[PDB]
Design a protein around this motif. Structure first.
Motif, PDB file in Angstrom:
ATOM      1  N   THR A 281      16.763  -2.336  73.843  1.00 42.93           N
ATOM      2  CA  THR A 281      17.100  -3.419  72.925  1.00 42.93           C
ATOM      3  C   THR A 281      17.450  -2.883  71.543  1.00 42.93           C
ATOM      4  OG1 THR A 281      15.838  -5.127  74.075  1.00 42.93           O
ATOM      5  CG2 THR A 281      16.177  -5.401  71.709  1.00 42.93           C
TER       6      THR A 281
ATOM      7  N   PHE B 205      16.810   6.040  81.016  1.00 45.72           N
ATOM      8  CA  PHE B 205      18.107   6.237  80.405  1.00 45.72           C
ATOM      9  C   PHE B 205      18.600   4.921  79.828  1.00 45.72           C
ATOM     10  CE2 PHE B 205      17.787   9.221  84.015  1.00 45.72           C
ATOM     11  CZ  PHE B 205      17.685  10.374  83.271  1.00 45.72           C
ATOM     12  N   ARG B 206      19.440   5.022  78.807  1.00 42.33           N
ATOM     13  CA  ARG B 206      19.951   3.828  78.152  1.00 42.33           C
ATOM     14  C   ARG B 206      20.868   3.034  79.070  1.00 42.33           C
ATOM     15  NH1 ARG B 206      22.852   7.228  73.869  1.00 42.33           N
ATOM     16  NH2 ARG B 206      20.817   6.908  72.882  1.00 42.33           N
ATOM     17  N   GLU B 207      20.727   1.718  79.004  1.00 44.16           N
ATOM     18  CA  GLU B 207      21.593   0.784  79.703  1.00 44.16           C
ATOM     19  C   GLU B 207      22.086  -0.195  78.654  1.00 44.16           C
ATOM     20  OE1 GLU B 207      19.795  -1.132  83.010  1.00 44.16           O
ATOM     21  OE2 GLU B 207      21.612  -2.210  83.608  1.00 44.16           O
TER      22      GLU B 207
ATOM     23  N   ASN C  36      17.390  19.653  69.480  1.00 50.36           N
ATOM     24  CA  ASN C  36      16.126  18.978  69.758  1.00 50.36           C
ATOM     25  C   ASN C  36      16.001  17.697  68.945  1.00 50.36           C
ATOM     26  OD1 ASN C  36      14.067  19.821  71.708  1.00 50.36           O
ATOM     27  ND2 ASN C  36      12.621  19.476  70.028  1.00 50.36           N
ATOM     28  N   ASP C  37      14.995  16.898  69.318  1.00 49.90           N
ATOM     29  CA  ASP C  37      14.761  15.595  68.700  1.00 49.90           C
ATOM     30  C   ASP C  37      14.390  15.721  67.236  1.00 49.90           C
ATOM     31  OD1 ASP C  37      14.649  13.425  71.008  1.00 49.90           O
ATOM     32  OD2 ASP C  37      13.723  15.300  71.690  1.00 49.90           O
TER      33      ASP C  37
ATOM     34  N   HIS D 202      18.538   0.115  70.837  1.00 55.77           N
ATOM     35  CA  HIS D 202      19.804   0.842  70.907  1.00 55.77           C
ATOM     36  C   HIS D 202      20.993  -0.112  70.863  1.00 55.77           C
ATOM     37  CE1 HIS D 202      17.365   4.343  71.902  1.00 55.77           C
ATOM     38  NE2 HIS D 202      18.450   5.082  71.770  1.00 55.77           N
TER      39      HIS D 202
ATOM     40  N   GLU E 140      11.995  -0.814  77.393  1.00 59.59           N
ATOM     41  CA  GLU E 140      12.902  -1.951  77.292  1.00 59.59           C
ATOM     42  C   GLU E 140      13.181  -2.273  75.832  1.00 59.59           C
ATOM     43  OE1 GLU E 140      14.673  -4.083  78.981  1.00 59.59           O
ATOM     44  OE2 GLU E 140      14.271  -3.600  81.083  1.00 59.59           O
ATOM     45  N   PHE E 141      12.144  -2.197  74.994  1.00 57.98           N
ATOM     46  CA  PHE E 141      12.336  -2.260  73.552  1.00 57.98           C
ATOM     47  C   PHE E 141      13.284  -1.173  73.068  1.00 57.98           C
ATOM     48  CE2 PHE E 141      10.857  -1.509  69.128  1.00 57.98           C
ATOM     49  CZ  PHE E 141      11.167  -2.752  68.624  1.00 57.98           C
TER      50      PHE E 141
ATOM     51  N   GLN F 121       5.905   0.607  72.955  1.00 57.75           N
ATOM     52  CA  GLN F 121       5.985  -0.706  73.582  1.00 57.75           C
ATOM     53  C   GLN F 121       6.715  -0.662  74.919  1.00 57.75           C
ATOM     54  OE1 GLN F 121       5.654  -0.433  70.359  1.00 57.75           O
ATOM     55  NE2 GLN F 121       5.192  -2.369  69.325  1.00 57.75           N
TER      56      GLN F 121
ATOM     57  N   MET G 245       6.645  14.676  77.574  1.00 59.27           N
ATOM     58  CA  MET G 245       5.766  14.746  78.734  1.00 59.27           C
ATOM     59  C   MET G 245       5.560  13.359  79.329  1.00 59.27           C
ATOM     60  SD  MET G 245       5.069  17.953  79.163  1.00 59.27           S
ATOM     61  CE  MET G 245       6.751  18.234  78.610  1.00 59.27           C
ATOM     62  N   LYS G 246       6.615  12.547  79.310  1.00 53.56           N
ATOM     63  CA  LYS G 246       6.556  11.183  79.809  1.00 53.56           C
ATOM     64  C   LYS G 246       7.796  10.873  80.631  1.00 53.56           C
ATOM     65  CE  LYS G 246       4.233   8.210  79.582  1.00 53.56           C
ATOM     66  NZ  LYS G 246       2.988   7.565  80.077  1.00 53.56           N
ATOM     67  N   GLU G 247       7.760   9.716  81.272  1.00 49.89           N
ATOM     68  CA  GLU G 247       8.816   9.300  82.181  1.00 49.89           C
ATOM     69  C   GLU G 247      10.075   8.965  81.399  1.00 49.89           C
ATOM     70  OE1 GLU G 247       6.554   6.900  85.114  1.00 49.89           O
ATOM     71  OE2 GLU G 247       8.533   6.192  85.751  1.00 49.89           O
ATOM     72  N   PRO G 248      11.207   9.602  81.677  1.00 50.34           N
ATOM     73  CA  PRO G 248      12.417   9.289  80.917  1.00 50.34           C
ATOM     74  C   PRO G 248      13.075   8.063  81.517  1.00 50.34           C
ATOM     75  CG  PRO G 248      12.854  11.075  82.424  1.00 50.34           C
ATOM     76  CD  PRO G 248      11.382  10.788  82.532  1.00 50.34           C
TER      77      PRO G 248
END
Ligand SMILES: CCCCCCCC/C=C\CCCCCCCC(=O)O[C@H](COC(=O)CCCCCCCCCCCCCCC)COP(=O)(O)O
Ligand SMILES: CCCCCCCC/C=C\CCCCCCCC(=O)O[C@H](COC(=O)CCCCCCCCCCCCCCC)COP(=O)(O)O
Ligand SMILES: CCCCCCCC/C=C\CCCCCCCC(=O)O[C@H](COC(=O)CCCCCCCCCCCCCCC)COP(=O)(O)O
Ligand SMILES: CC(C)CCC[C@@H](C)[C@H]1CC[C@H]2[C@@H]3CC=C4C[C@@H](O)CC[C@]4(C)[C@H]3CC[C@]12C
Ligand SMILES: CC(C)CCC[C@@H](C)[C@H]1CC[C@H]2[C@@H]3CC=C4C[C@@H](O)CC[C@]4(C)[C@H]3CC[C@]12C
Ligand SMILES: CC(C)CCC[C@@H](C)[C@H]1CC[C@H]2[C@@H]3CC=C4C[C@@H](O)CC[C@]4(C)[C@H]3CC[C@]12C
Ligand SMILES: CC(C)CCC[C@@H](C)[C@H]1CC[C@H]2[C@@H]3CC=C4C[C@@H](O)CC[C@]4(C)[C@H]3CC[C@]12C
Ligand SMILES: CC(C)CCC[C@@H](C)[C@H]1CC[C@H]2[C@@H]3CC=C4C[C@@H](O)CC[C@]4(C)[C@H]3CC[C@]12C
Ligand SMILES: CC(C)CCC[C@@H](C)[C@H]1CC[C@H]2[C@@H]3CC=C4C[C@@H](O)CC[C@]4(C)[C@H]3CC[C@]12C
Lengths: 284, 125, 110, 284, 284, 125, 110, 125, 110
Positions: free
Chosen positions: A256, A6-8, A169-170, A258, A252-253, A249, A1-4
């Motif tokens: 990092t 995506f990995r960079e 699922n997770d 990943h 961005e963490f 956090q 229920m939060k803003e996704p």
């Protein structure tokens, strides 16, 4: 229920870093494992207790090494081998490292039995090296790949085929990551730590030269094992914790961690090619 | 083959709520996200939101945020989009499009926009 | 965020000769890895939009050779080498590089 | 009288990199140091000249290792241990590394005395290992921590307690950095370099097999010591030079050198956990 | 016929990373090479077959090490030594590494001849170590530096003198890079790989303890050699491929590969300082 | 407890110079920087400059840069701010606020803004 | 550099019910580590400004529970759950993330 | 010493093409790029393009791109610049300037702008 | 891309006293390594432009000591400590830090 988010990731750096590490590991592992297999199984034709452990470890390392070119091709270019090869590669990759780490633990336990009390250690050592080793290392390794054998398949997106592991699922991802880290790190690590210390505690009673050799060797083995494995499992554990929404956090963490997991997973494969050097002291 | 089927056309009064359903068949529903998009009469196709159908981290657009919800169902392999605070300009055609790829080790968003649903139209009066 | 304009808005073309439609983005649609993502959609009336070319200058399976795209950086375009009677419909160009996505204005072929 | 720019660092990378390095060092150092202390002091009950040096080095390494969890907690989260624990941790950290490096130099000097001219080396070796070692390694190490014992205290800012070293001006920081680098690098480094070369120069006169073993061992020791210590001291030296306003490349270079110092300070702690492997050749 | 993009590199990181690596390599190489030269040539006055190879390798490593301060100064500050010194430094740098790698291959071949069939290996071994070694390692190394001796000169731009290698076109650069990688990696690598495997295949027929020592040593040597050299040559090869306009991923990848080549070229110099440790087992 | 005490109110003629003093007591003066700020009558609080009181790398604001100086004293633990080129609009209330943290290994600037001085007012006529 | 506006400029409130004051920054006040720094100051007449909450949604020791802040990204606000007779004064919101710092416009509570 | 010599002045009709030659002597021609620049009467000096004379990756300016070409020759050590679509405002003085440094391991562009050619003027009528 | 303005456009100066010419860039002309590149050119009539100072505050060999430059960040200037009868000509300031390069407006000394 939060803003996704995506990995960079640094694809440009990975496309150069993964192939070279994979090439080094492939060359060294093929050389060492083929040489030790030729030395032990093909020519001796009469093996002792430690030779069987060495052969099992070498077979596991060679099985892991065989799949390296597929990983290198996937890192460099698109997947081009189909669903069945994706499943087979994933299964071999999951089996080999589990087998190697459990053989490490079993070698440690065999040394414990052989060194501390060898007066009445004939029958238990023989039984452990004959029968128990199979159901100890190989059967659980095969059983743990059922989720891998089931949930791993290639996905079609645009043109790029993706050989990845898909979980509904997770929770499935978390439970499997926790089981992986728990087994692989906690069990053999505790076994080795509670083993070698007692071994060299008992050695110093009446021997003066073997004690310093053992003190040097066990520290070398522990340092190599931990330096190879700890950062990868730490990254996995903190990734699982942030996946459980108990670490917040930002993300961005998350990018990092990943990147850290990817790089450390690439680096931790040196164990397979470096094992033959470490465990050349078994017979003495 | 892979396909997406939406519900029928609907007429509603202003201030009411609408529910639109999107059933996806022919592939694994828990490996690709779903984006809901709208086409107004005589206007370009405009995005509103996306739901991952795997960890359920939905994301909205500022034009519509605060009045729409998205909910998935793995067992029925269906996606539902509820819209409240209905207005006069909300009469349009809504489409359900597969968007993005979600996996354990691959979670990007530029691999998709391939297959669209049949599209359902809703009007207000 | 990214805004696009399509040119021309209306392109009436006589059957038998090629045509072109060009759209440029607000900023450079180049991702970190050096790849670019831009696709073109054709929508016949009464139908859902159809994906002609997925990545710029790359088309899907199952469409005629007449459609072909080209472009880079900020400028992209699609050319139809031959106009057929069944190539009438709306045309859009959309990008999937930045969050969120944005569609094109829409071009009508007569 | 210039524009101040504040430090900007990769906190996200540090929060993952420092805990894992600290964990590896803690595990390996605890294992090795505890094992060697148990072997040497607890069980032998009769020690030679080299065993005392080994025990001193192990005690220093264990003292350094004990404080590692506090550093890991500080790196991960806020300081939560108070002013007195901050002072004690800083004092132990300053004492341990000085003691270890001076014991390295003393072991080198003892080897010099024992190998080159052993005919009349009984009394000087015995006196050096009995009395001189204390006032040589331990007393100066304790004396050099008076600035640390005085100027180290916790600071309250917002909510985050900061266990840091506070100096009233840049001159104090410079003088202390120069003294630290001067002692730690220059003195034992020169001693070892002018020692081992002469040792193996004298060995080759009449011995054919000990010479190659010594040539391999001294090169291993020198390579390990320098690879561990040189980058950290180079970073400190160039930071001091740019603090003296004789190096002016902007201050993006200043942020880069600060990151380099942090990472290299994290990496250089491997010396404590790696010493027991290197110095297992003393008795032969 | 395309848009040129100029290289952008992390100068701030390089200005700290190159001097410290160069200092470590310089210290370790000077120490080890001087010690082994003093041991072998100055004092023995009677050398065997392996001692000549050791002396040649040490001379090559020392020649490479001598030029390191010039590289460090160039990395830190402007070139201040003139055209002739630029040419001489480039020539020595090109000669030394070729000589060292060819001596590695020659030592491998000598071991092959001495170990497998030693009954009739007296004359070929003596001839190879007496006459063939010169025209094998030194003459081709000198001949390959003619392009370096001709096309290397200092360029004046603004104030900064640039000691660089200038080629009239990309084809010259490509041909020379391909020749360099081909020789240096392919020839000695294939020789060593096809050599040591056969050696230890033949050892296991009647010897039980030498076989495991050789299995440990050859794997150590191969791992060190490949880990030192492979990433640099991989970077050079992919740079040549992208220079041939058969790899088109943009040119951010080009900047990334240039940074990779610079860093790996800095790192690969550890071979010269690490050789004396590896090859201390020749006499046994 | 920790506190900051400023000087008294002042009246000055245009074109003159003013000196304002800020004595800090109750804590280590050489671990936190000091920022000087101004509040004009009927206007928001506006920053002008900051002095580190440790290495003395002062920094200014373009609105005031070129006409103000800042000088610290460790022995008396005091901060002084001299202002020249006095104008008509410079009549205001000046505050001395602890700002930032300075140390050997911690030199950030987002830890502060906690304690303020009593504040001194200066007028021109 | 960063400019802020406070809303409302003047908020007269009757004693006994909660009130709210909202301020938004020009850009996102998120630092590199993912933390955000924004504090709220109350200034009674004749006194120096007092620091109510230091980090957004975190208040200091020694103030009543009535004040509480909330917000993220660009939008931040402070709500007083109950208005007391001693809560009259000027209110400002300031950020310390970028150099230099900037204060708020100022809100009066009547 | 190092020098650059251009061709003579030229007069041309609108819509024609012009070729300008730049001979560089006194140094290695294959180590520095060449930039062509224009000075209009009563206007600031304006850049148009650059050719590397080593790998020949020329680059243009949007004001002139699409109507100019640049070609080098190592054997004669000369640079040629061909301009088509001649207009009325193209009457100006063209200069050939050494710009940038090109090498195997040094390929920057901020080391140059030192020596200029004699400069040739072209007019249209 | 970078645009510059020179001040003043025309500077008539009597022989015997120093003069100054100042130009500021649109953005900061600081490269990644912390160095800055900006040069000043003098063009006598009928001649090609001459490079007086190559890097800001650094002049070439072969010119009198009268010319000297100074500046940083965005603001740069050149001062002639003494005006001589042979110092009449056009003056430009150009930067070589970003692609492409840009020249100055041009200053005439009378
Ligand atoms: C046990 C045997 C060990 C042998 C080890 C040999 C393998 C070592 C190879 C080292 C290669 C040097 C890596 C540095 C390359 C940096 C390139 C660069 O510019 O990186 C840039 C970004 O930097 C990074 O992310 C790279 C930094 C992380 C990688 C560091 C790896 C450390 C090596 C560990 C080896 C341990 C032994 C490019 O950015 P983008 O991708 O966004 O364009
Ligand atoms: C003697 C025994 C030695 C055993 C050594 C084992 C420990 C090695 C661990 C290696 C972990 C791999 C590190 C690479 C991680 C890169 C992650 C990444 O994306 O970095 C990014 C930035 O990159 C960096 O600053 C990291 C590059 C510097 C660190 C390189 C450390 C090299 C390892 C030395 C080991 C020597 C042995 C993230 O940026 P931000 O923080 O701004 O978000
Ligand atoms: C065989 C004996 C081996 C002994 C090895 C000892 C030498 C190891 C030295 C390690 C130093 C730690 C390096 C990390 C420093 C990172 C600093 C940093 O902030 O990097 C930033 C960018 O990051 C980078 O590009 C650095 C990452 C690539 C370098 C990684 C080198 C890995 C070490 C390999 C050693 C293998 C053994 C600064 O950015 P800019 O330049 O644009 O301002
Ligand atoms: C589907 C995949 C993962 C199945 C892998 C199973 C194969 C490769 C594994 C399973 C058990 C393994 C065997 C286990 C025990 C021994 C005894 C040893 O003295 C020689 C090797 C040998 C004979 C192994 C060879 C490899 C082996 C047969
Ligand atoms: C795989 C990478 C990331 C980590 C590699 C760590 C292991 C393999 C390295 C780290 C430190 C190394 C040790 C450092 C010092 C010595 C002392 C020397 O006299 C014998 C080798 C020995 C014992 C090294 C063996 C290899 C070693 C244990
Ligand atoms: C405040 C802190 C830094 C004080 C640390 C002092 C303690 C931990 C140090 C100071 C001197 C050290 C002793 C020095 C010499 C010896 C003799 C050796 O054969 C056993 C260890 C032993 C007995 C050491 C134990 C640790 C010791 C007692
Ligand atoms: C702490 C990190 C950063 C640096 C570690 C450097 C030291 C510990 C490493 C660097 C190179 C390594 C050596 C490389 C090669 C050999 C030859 C082998 O036959 C025995 C081990 C030995 C001698 C290694 C011992 C460990 C060693 C000396
Ligand atoms: C211009 C530069 C590259 C020329 C370098 C040539 C010199 C330095 C090289 C060329 C051939 C080398 C010799 C080759 C063979 C031997 C025999 C050996 O038992 C001692 C060293 C010795 C005598 C070498 C000394 C160094 C040497 C003379
Ligand atoms: C130059 C850098 C980048 C790569 C260095 C790689 C070489 C020198 C390192 C990598 C792995 C290391 C080996 C790891 C483990 C062991 C086992 C130990 O019992 C003896 C040393 C030995 C055999 C190490 C020797 C040095 C070694 C071979």
């Amino acid at each position: 229920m939060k803003e996704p988010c995506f990995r960079e990731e640094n694809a440009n750096f990975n496309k150069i870093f993964l192939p070279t590490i994979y090439s080094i590991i492939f060359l060294t592992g093929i050389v060492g494992n083929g040489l030790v297999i030729l030395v032990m199984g093909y020519q001796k034709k009469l093996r002792s207790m430690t030779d069987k452990y060495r052969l099992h470890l070498s077979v596991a390392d060679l099985l892991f090494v065989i799949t390296l070119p597929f990983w290198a091709v996937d890192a460099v270019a698109n997947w081009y081998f189909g669903n069945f090869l994706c499943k087979a590669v994933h299964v071999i990759y999951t089996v080999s490292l589990y087998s190697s780490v459990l053989i490490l633990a079993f070698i440690s336990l065999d040394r414990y039995l052989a060194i501390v009390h060898a007066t009445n250690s004939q029958r238990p050592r023989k039984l452990l090296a004959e029968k128990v080793v199979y159901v100890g290392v190989w059967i659980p390794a095969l059983l743990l790949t059922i989720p891998d054998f089931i949930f791993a398949n290639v996905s079609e997106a645009d043109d790029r085929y993706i050989c990845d592991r898909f979980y509904p699922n997770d929770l499935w991802v978390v439970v499997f990551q926790f089981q992986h880290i728990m087994v692989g790190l906690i069990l053999p690590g505790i076994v080795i730590l509670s083993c070698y210390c007692i071994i060299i505690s008992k050695l110093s009673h009446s021997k003066g030269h073997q004690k310093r050799k053992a003190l040097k060797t066990t520290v070398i083995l522990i340092l190599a094992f931990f330096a190879c494995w700890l950062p990868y499992y730490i990254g996995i554990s903190i990734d699982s914790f942030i996946l459980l929404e108990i670490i917040k956090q930002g993300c961005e963490f998350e990018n990092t961690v990943h990147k850290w997991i990817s790089i450390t997973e690439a680096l931790a494969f040196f164990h397979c090619c470096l094992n033959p050097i470490l465990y050349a002291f078994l017979g003495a | 083959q892979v396909q997406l089927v939406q519900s029928g056309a609907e007429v509603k009064k202003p201030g009411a709520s609408v529910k639109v359903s999107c059933k996806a068949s022919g592939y694994t529903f828990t490996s690709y996200g779903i984006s809901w998009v709208r086409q107004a009469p005589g206007q370009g196709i405009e995005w509103m939101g996306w739901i991952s159908t795997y960890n359920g981290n939905r994301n909205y657009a500022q034009k519509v945020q605060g009045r729409v919800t998205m909910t998935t169902d793995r067992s029925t392999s269906t996606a539902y989009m509820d819209l409240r605070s209905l207005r006069s300009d909300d009469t349009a055609v809504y489409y359900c499009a597969r968007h993005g790829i979600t996996g354990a080790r691959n979670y990007y968003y530029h691999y998709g926009m391939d297959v669209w649903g049949q599209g359902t139209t809703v009007t207000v009066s | 965020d990214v805004v696009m304009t399509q040119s021309p808005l209306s392109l009436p073309v006589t059957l038998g000769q090629p045509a072109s439609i060009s759209c440029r983005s607000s900023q450079s649609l180049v991702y970190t890895d050096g790849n670019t993502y831009l696709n073109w959609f054709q929508q016949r009336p009464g139908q859902s939009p159809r994906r002609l070319i997925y990545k710029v200058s790359n088309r899907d399976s199952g469409v005629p050779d007449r459609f072909s795209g080209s472009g880079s950086g900020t400028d992209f375009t699609l050319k139809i080498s031959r106009v057929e009677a069944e190539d009438v419909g709306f045309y859009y160009c959309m990008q999937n590089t930045h969050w969120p996505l944005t569609f094109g204005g829409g071009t009508k072929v007569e």
